[PDB]
Design a protein around this nucleic acid. Structure first.
Ligand code: SAH
Length: 221
RNA sequence: GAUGUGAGGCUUCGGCCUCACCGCUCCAUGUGCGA
Protein backbone atom coordinates (compact mmCIF):
# COMPACT_ATOMS: atom_id res chain seq x y z
CA UNK A 1 0.00 0.00 0.00
CA UNK A 2 1.30 3.41 -1.10
CA UNK A 3 -0.94 5.70 0.89
CA UNK A 4 0.96 8.85 -0.18
CA UNK A 5 1.16 7.97 -3.86
CA UNK A 6 4.75 6.98 -3.03
CA UNK A 7 4.83 4.24 -5.69
CA UNK A 8 8.28 2.69 -5.98
CA UNK A 9 7.73 1.71 -9.68
CA UNK A 10 5.75 4.79 -10.71
CA UNK A 11 7.40 5.82 -13.96
CA UNK A 12 7.43 2.23 -15.19
CA UNK A 13 3.68 2.50 -15.72
CA UNK A 14 3.22 6.24 -16.17
CA UNK A 15 5.88 6.39 -18.93
CA UNK A 16 6.32 2.83 -20.28
CA UNK A 17 7.77 4.40 -23.45
CA UNK A 18 10.24 6.18 -21.07
CA UNK A 19 9.19 9.45 -22.80
CA UNK A 20 7.31 11.81 -20.43
CA UNK A 21 4.79 13.72 -22.54
CA UNK A 22 4.88 16.60 -20.04
CA UNK A 23 8.35 17.54 -21.37
CA UNK A 24 6.62 18.64 -24.60
CA UNK A 25 4.34 20.93 -22.56
CA UNK A 26 6.66 22.46 -19.96
CA UNK A 27 8.67 25.29 -21.49
CA UNK A 28 12.49 25.40 -21.18
CA UNK A 29 12.44 29.18 -20.62
CA UNK A 30 10.46 28.55 -17.42
CA UNK A 31 13.49 26.86 -15.83
CA UNK A 32 16.71 28.04 -17.46
CA UNK A 33 18.80 29.95 -14.92
CA UNK A 34 16.00 29.76 -12.32
CA UNK A 35 15.63 28.32 -8.82
CA UNK A 36 13.14 25.44 -8.99
CA UNK A 37 11.41 23.40 -6.28
CA UNK A 38 9.92 20.02 -7.40
CA UNK A 39 7.26 18.88 -4.89
CA UNK A 40 6.65 15.15 -4.54
CA UNK A 41 9.54 14.33 -6.85
CA UNK A 42 9.26 10.50 -6.35
CA UNK A 43 12.38 8.82 -7.81
CA UNK A 44 13.07 12.04 -9.71
CA UNK A 45 12.93 11.00 -13.37
CA UNK A 46 11.10 14.20 -14.30
CA UNK A 47 13.14 16.32 -11.88
CA UNK A 48 16.36 15.03 -13.42
CA UNK A 49 15.10 15.38 -17.01
CA UNK A 50 14.55 19.10 -16.36
CA UNK A 51 17.78 19.59 -14.38
CA UNK A 52 20.04 18.01 -16.97
CA UNK A 53 18.61 19.54 -20.15
CA UNK A 54 17.00 22.91 -19.28
CA UNK A 55 19.78 24.29 -17.05
CA UNK A 56 18.07 25.52 -13.89
CA UNK A 57 20.56 27.20 -11.58
CA UNK A 58 19.12 25.24 -8.65
CA UNK A 59 16.70 22.29 -8.66
CA UNK A 60 15.41 20.85 -5.37
CA UNK A 61 13.42 17.61 -5.41
CA UNK A 62 11.34 17.04 -2.27
CA UNK A 63 9.51 13.85 -1.35
CA UNK A 64 8.00 12.55 1.86
CA UNK A 65 9.41 9.03 1.24
CA UNK A 66 13.12 8.67 2.10
CA UNK A 67 13.35 5.47 0.04
CA UNK A 68 12.29 7.32 -3.12
CA UNK A 69 14.72 10.15 -2.33
CA UNK A 70 17.59 7.67 -2.01
CA UNK A 71 16.50 6.20 -5.36
CA UNK A 72 16.44 9.68 -6.89
CA UNK A 73 20.02 10.28 -5.75
CA UNK A 74 21.03 6.98 -7.35
CA UNK A 75 19.23 7.95 -10.58
CA UNK A 76 21.44 11.03 -11.16
CA UNK A 77 24.08 8.90 -12.92
CA UNK A 78 21.53 7.92 -15.59
CA UNK A 79 21.39 11.55 -16.76
CA UNK A 80 25.13 12.17 -17.12
CA UNK A 81 26.30 25.24 -11.68
CA UNK A 82 26.01 22.73 -14.52
CA UNK A 83 24.22 19.42 -14.08
CA UNK A 84 24.63 17.38 -11.82
CA UNK A 85 25.75 20.15 -9.46
CA UNK A 86 22.48 22.09 -9.87
CA UNK A 87 20.21 19.38 -8.37
CA UNK A 88 19.66 18.23 -4.79
CA UNK A 89 17.06 15.98 -3.15
CA UNK A 90 15.46 16.30 0.29
CA UNK A 91 13.17 14.07 2.35
CA UNK A 92 10.29 15.97 3.94
CA UNK A 93 6.57 16.50 4.29
CA UNK A 94 5.73 19.77 2.53
CA UNK A 95 2.42 20.13 4.45
CA UNK A 96 2.96 22.18 7.61
CA UNK A 97 1.38 21.38 10.98
CA UNK A 98 0.18 24.91 11.82
CA UNK A 99 -1.09 27.94 9.91
CA UNK A 100 1.54 29.98 11.79
CA UNK A 101 4.34 27.92 10.19
CA UNK A 102 2.74 28.28 6.74
CA UNK A 103 2.71 32.13 6.84
CA UNK A 104 6.36 32.36 7.99
CA UNK A 105 7.74 30.89 4.74
CA UNK A 106 10.29 33.16 2.96
CA UNK A 107 10.64 33.37 -0.86
CA UNK A 108 13.37 31.18 -2.32
CA UNK A 109 12.15 29.87 -5.68
CA UNK A 110 11.26 31.25 -9.10
CA UNK A 111 9.34 28.08 -10.02
CA UNK A 112 7.49 25.50 -7.93
CA UNK A 113 6.39 22.24 -9.61
CA UNK A 114 3.31 20.63 -8.03
CA UNK A 115 2.65 17.78 -10.44
CA UNK A 116 0.34 14.87 -9.63
CA UNK A 117 0.57 15.70 -5.92
CA UNK A 118 -2.68 17.45 -4.95
CA UNK A 119 -4.76 14.26 -4.74
CA UNK A 120 -2.35 12.71 -2.25
CA UNK A 121 -2.03 15.80 -0.09
CA UNK A 122 -5.82 16.19 -0.26
CA UNK A 123 -6.54 12.59 0.79
CA UNK A 124 -3.93 12.48 3.53
CA UNK A 125 -4.33 15.93 5.10
CA UNK A 126 -7.78 17.07 3.90
CA UNK A 127 -8.80 20.47 2.58
CA UNK A 128 -6.82 22.05 5.43
CA UNK A 129 -3.60 20.30 4.42
CA UNK A 130 -4.09 21.09 0.72
CA UNK A 131 -4.68 24.79 1.47
CA UNK A 132 -1.58 24.92 3.69
CA UNK A 133 0.41 23.52 0.76
CA UNK A 134 -1.11 26.07 -1.62
CA UNK A 135 -0.42 28.99 0.73
CA UNK A 136 3.11 27.75 1.41
CA UNK A 137 3.91 27.50 -2.31
CA UNK A 138 2.85 31.12 -2.81
CA UNK A 139 4.94 32.31 0.14
CA UNK A 140 7.93 30.32 -1.15
CA UNK A 141 7.79 32.04 -4.57
CA UNK A 142 9.55 35.27 -5.38
CA UNK A 143 7.61 38.07 -7.09
CA UNK A 144 7.35 37.03 -10.73
CA UNK A 145 7.44 33.35 -9.78
CA UNK A 146 5.26 30.61 -11.23
CA UNK A 147 3.48 27.57 -9.86
CA UNK A 148 3.14 24.73 -12.37
CA UNK A 149 0.09 22.76 -11.23
CA UNK A 150 -0.99 19.35 -12.58
CA UNK A 151 -3.96 18.26 -10.43
CA UNK A 152 -5.77 14.92 -10.55
CA UNK A 153 -9.54 15.05 -11.17
CA UNK A 154 -11.98 14.32 -8.37
CA UNK A 155 -13.30 11.26 -10.24
CA UNK A 156 -9.95 9.55 -9.63
CA UNK A 157 -9.88 9.98 -5.80
CA UNK A 158 -12.57 7.44 -4.92
CA UNK A 159 -10.67 4.30 -5.83
CA UNK A 160 -8.02 5.19 -3.22
CA UNK A 161 -10.37 6.16 -0.40
CA UNK A 162 -10.02 2.88 1.53
CA UNK A 163 -6.21 2.98 1.80
CA UNK A 164 -6.48 4.14 5.46
CA UNK A 165 -9.25 5.21 7.83
CA UNK A 166 -7.83 8.76 7.81
CA UNK A 167 -7.83 8.89 4.03
CA UNK A 168 -11.39 7.51 4.02
CA UNK A 169 -12.42 10.10 6.59
CA UNK A 170 -10.85 12.93 4.56
CA UNK A 171 -12.43 11.75 1.30
CA UNK A 172 -15.92 12.30 2.69
CA UNK A 173 -15.00 15.62 4.33
CA UNK A 174 -13.39 17.24 1.26
CA UNK A 175 -15.28 20.34 0.10
CA UNK A 176 -12.62 22.14 -1.99
CA UNK A 177 -12.74 20.10 -5.18
CA UNK A 178 -10.17 20.27 -8.03
CA UNK A 179 -12.68 22.25 -10.12
CA UNK A 180 -12.31 25.02 -7.50
CA UNK A 181 -8.47 24.99 -7.20
CA UNK A 182 -8.00 27.86 -9.68
CA UNK A 183 -10.42 30.17 -7.88
CA UNK A 184 -8.85 29.32 -4.51
CA UNK A 185 -5.26 29.87 -5.70
CA UNK A 186 -6.18 33.31 -7.11
CA UNK A 187 -8.29 34.32 -4.08
CA UNK A 188 -6.81 36.57 -1.36
CA UNK A 189 -6.27 33.45 0.79
CA UNK A 190 -3.35 32.53 -1.52
CA UNK A 191 -2.82 35.45 -3.87
CA UNK A 192 -1.77 34.32 -7.35
CA UNK A 193 -2.64 37.16 -9.71
CA UNK A 194 -3.39 35.22 -12.93
CA UNK A 195 -3.30 31.76 -14.40
CA UNK A 196 -3.42 29.90 -17.69
CA UNK A 197 -4.16 26.39 -18.91
CA UNK A 198 -0.95 25.47 -20.71
CA UNK A 199 -2.04 22.20 -22.36
CA UNK A 200 -3.01 18.61 -21.63
CA UNK A 201 0.00 16.36 -22.38
CA UNK A 202 -0.39 13.09 -24.22
CA UNK A 203 0.05 9.81 -22.38
CA UNK A 204 -0.56 6.16 -23.28
CA UNK A 205 -3.26 6.09 -20.59
CA UNK A 206 -6.15 8.54 -20.52
CA UNK A 207 -5.87 8.48 -16.70
CA UNK A 208 -2.58 10.39 -16.98
CA UNK A 209 -3.83 13.04 -19.44
CA UNK A 210 -4.19 15.80 -16.87
CA UNK A 211 -4.31 19.58 -17.49
CA UNK A 212 -1.14 21.56 -16.76
CA UNK A 213 -1.75 25.03 -15.30
CA UNK A 214 0.60 27.97 -14.85
CA UNK A 215 -0.14 30.23 -11.85
CA UNK A 216 1.67 33.58 -11.84
CA UNK A 217 2.85 35.52 -8.81
CA UNK A 218 2.81 39.22 -9.65
CA UNK A 219 6.10 41.06 -10.11
CA UNK A 220 4.88 44.21 -8.39
CA UNK A 221 4.41 44.26 -4.58
C1' G B 1 -6.68 -0.57 -15.83
C1' A B 2 -10.91 -3.72 -14.39
C1' U B 3 -17.83 -4.43 -11.19
C1' G B 4 -20.32 -9.23 -13.30
C1' U B 5 -25.48 -12.23 -12.63
C1' G B 6 -30.88 -13.00 -11.66
C1' A B 7 -36.24 -11.95 -10.19
C1' G B 8 -39.75 -8.20 -9.52
C1' G B 9 -41.12 -3.03 -10.18
C1' C B 10 -40.90 1.76 -12.36
C1' U B 11 -39.41 3.99 -16.64
C1' U B 12 -39.11 10.21 -19.57
C1' C B 13 -36.32 3.77 -22.85
C1' G B 14 -30.83 7.33 -20.39
C1' G B 15 -31.56 3.97 -16.87
C1' C B 16 -33.27 3.86 -12.07
C1' C B 17 -35.42 1.31 -7.40
C1' U B 18 -36.16 -3.09 -4.02
C1' C B 19 -34.49 -7.80 -3.06
C1' A B 20 -31.53 -11.94 -4.13
C1' C B 21 -26.55 -13.59 -5.92
C1' C B 22 -21.22 -12.92 -7.11
C1' G B 23 -17.23 -10.39 -4.98
C1' C B 24 -15.02 -7.08 -1.39
C1' U B 25 -10.03 -8.17 -5.07
C1' C B 26 -7.27 -9.03 -9.50
C1' C B 27 -4.06 -6.98 -13.26
C1' A B 28 -0.19 -3.41 -15.00
C1' U B 29 4.30 -1.27 -12.97
C1' G B 30 12.21 -0.35 -10.85
C1' U B 31 16.44 4.25 -14.27
C1' G B 32 16.38 1.90 -6.42
C1' C B 33 18.62 -2.49 -3.99
C1' G B 34 22.30 -7.38 -4.28
C1' A B 35 22.44 -10.13 2.52
N1 SAH C 1 3.05 15.88 1.87
C1 SAH C 1 3.97 15.48 0.99
N2 SAH C 1 5.19 16.09 0.95
C2 SAH C 1 6.16 15.69 0.05
N3 SAH C 1 5.90 14.67 -0.85
C3 SAH C 1 4.69 14.07 -0.83
C4 SAH C 1 3.70 14.46 0.08
N4 SAH C 1 2.61 13.69 -0.15
C5 SAH C 1 2.89 12.82 -1.16
N5 SAH C 1 4.18 13.06 -1.58
C6 SAH C 1 4.92 12.39 -2.67
O1 SAH C 1 4.39 12.79 -3.91
C7 SAH C 1 4.77 11.86 -4.90
C8 SAH C 1 3.67 11.72 -5.95
S1 SAH C 1 4.27 10.71 -7.35
C9 SAH C 1 4.34 12.18 -8.45
C10 SAH C 1 5.75 12.37 -8.99
C11 SAH C 1 6.08 13.64 -9.76
N6 SAH C 1 5.57 14.85 -9.08
C12 SAH C 1 5.55 13.52 -11.18
O2 SAH C 1 4.57 14.18 -11.54
O3 SAH C 1 6.09 12.75 -12.00
C13 SAH C 1 4.99 10.55 -4.16
O4 SAH C 1 6.30 10.13 -4.41
C14 SAH C 1 4.76 10.87 -2.68
O5 SAH C 1 5.67 10.26 -1.80
Amino acid sequence: KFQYGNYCKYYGYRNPSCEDGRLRVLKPEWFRGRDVLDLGCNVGHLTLSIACKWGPSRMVGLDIDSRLIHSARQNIRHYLSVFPNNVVFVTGNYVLDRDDLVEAQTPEYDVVLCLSLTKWVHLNWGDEGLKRMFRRIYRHLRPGGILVLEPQPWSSYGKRKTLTETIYKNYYRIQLKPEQFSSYLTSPDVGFSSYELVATPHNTSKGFQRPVYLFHKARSP
